[PDB]
Amino acid sequence: MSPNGNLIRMLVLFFLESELHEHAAYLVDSLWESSQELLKDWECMTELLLEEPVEEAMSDRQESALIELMVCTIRQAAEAHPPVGRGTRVLTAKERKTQIDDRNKLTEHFIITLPMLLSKYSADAEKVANLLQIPQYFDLEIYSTGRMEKHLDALLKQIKFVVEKHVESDVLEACSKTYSILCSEEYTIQNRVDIARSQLIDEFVDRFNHSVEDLLQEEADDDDIYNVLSTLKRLTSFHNAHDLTKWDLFGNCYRLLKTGIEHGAMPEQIVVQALQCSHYSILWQLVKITDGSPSKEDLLVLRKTVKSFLAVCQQCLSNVNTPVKEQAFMLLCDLLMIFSHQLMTGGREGLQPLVFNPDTGLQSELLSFVMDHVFIDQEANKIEALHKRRNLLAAFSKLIIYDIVDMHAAADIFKHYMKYYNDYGDIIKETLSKT
């Protein structure tokens, strides 16, 4: 009760104070054979996080660490195997009997408790985003069984509160996934969740649309810019896993982008988002046309939209801000691969009119950006910045293999930059071997 509250309050210390476990998930896994009972006392944890102290309190850092360890205990219990990167795998009678029971306990528990956790820590992005990893492991049918409808409203009350307080990519993406999980995976609750959502959205589209109109008509306030980007972000986040096509968002994005090309004076994050949103709008328009039995005008309407957007993305390569160029490029290398001749695979030859071949002028810019923004001259930030350029190239690499860009002009650049490996490599190899 308080005995297990000591063991866990010291476990959060042993993890934070010693460098002996860098990864929470690995720590929990290592103790799991020996210390399962203790590590599945979720009532003990949720207590320590919600209670007020008598004496000694918890530190913001230690709180964050309990939340993180907790989620890792919830996963290991649900999945009933060591985490990604410690695995090997056939449960026995009892192992499976235990798993079902653990899933029951953490669902029955967290349905009640997770609304309250979110409540208290509502403004802590890192904490909120880590708590929202928990529903995926719910036995969601129990939002019926336990007559627990009151608590599902309570999660949704709190998820609404978070998205309304937050603009960080981690929180919103975390909130979005949670809605996807609460939806599809049991009809019983699907209808209730669907409404809380499409009302959540409506409030944000009305807010975005007014902001957009505010911005463009205006001299343009620091607020005008706050409001446009603030709302857009919430919607872009959601539009990846949520089919927001019914709200014509592509329209206002396309205006913001067009205003930022024209008068050259659109803030860099508005543009990047405005893009990423448009792109999600387009992918969703495509799916409805793939799975439907679509008409001639249908194809030709989406086509006109795609060709107008491919031009925006191309144009946005010229934007001063390199975050824009990177996005612009990343979408160009995606879109040109999607609306390639591959689109006519699986007897879907009806889609010919959608296919796009990128011109010389565009191909010469898709080379430009590589030479300028992959292959540059000159701590934690830089290993991350590298894997990005890596991805930017790997996504351009796909266009080279299927001759969507001039493959010869590309390999000529790959010559020019790999020179010092062709020209001096052997000599540097055998040298470093003998030291």
Ligand SMILES: Cc1ccc(NC(=O)c2ccccc2C)c(O)c1
């Ligand atoms: C995703 C995202 C990023 C940034 C912002 N907002 C701001 O940057 C902002 C707003 C008003 C006054 C000062 C600042 C710095 C936002 O709303 C959404």
